[PDB]
Write a structure and sequence with these properties.
The protein has 70 residues and is mainly alpha-helical. It has one domain (1-70): Homeodomain-like (Arc Repressor Mutant, subunit A, Orthogonal Bundle). It is built from 3 helices and no strands. The longest helix has 19 residues, at 20-38. This is Transcriptional regulator (NtrC family). The PDB classes it as transcription. The entry lists the keywords DNA-binding domains, 54 transcriptional activators, NifA like homolog - 2(NIh-2), transcription. The assembly is monomeric. The entry is titled "Structure, function, and tethering of DNA-binding domains in 54 transcriptional activators".
Length: 70
């Protein structure tokens, strides 16, 4: 390669493409967000997000999210 340019402009980003990390990140962030906004409440966080106690709970255990509630 005789040429030695950075090719910054020639470089084409690849926005298209779905990954699991994004899902687990957007999902966990949503659950934790709703909970914190609800005051660390699964019931509220669930009804707020749009999931049932079963779904929410499954996400909390899978994402190992924390919450202050007795």
């Amino acid at each position: 390669t005789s040429s030695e340019l950075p090719e910054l402009l020639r470089k084409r980003e690849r926005k298209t493409g779905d990954l699991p990390k994004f899902i687990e990140e957007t999902e966990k962030k949503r659950i934790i967000e709703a909970l914190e906004k609800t005051g660390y409440v699964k019931s509220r966080a669930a009804k707020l997000l749009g999931y049932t106690l079963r779904q929410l709970d499954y996400r909390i255990k899978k994402y190992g999210i924390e919450l202050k509630k007795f």
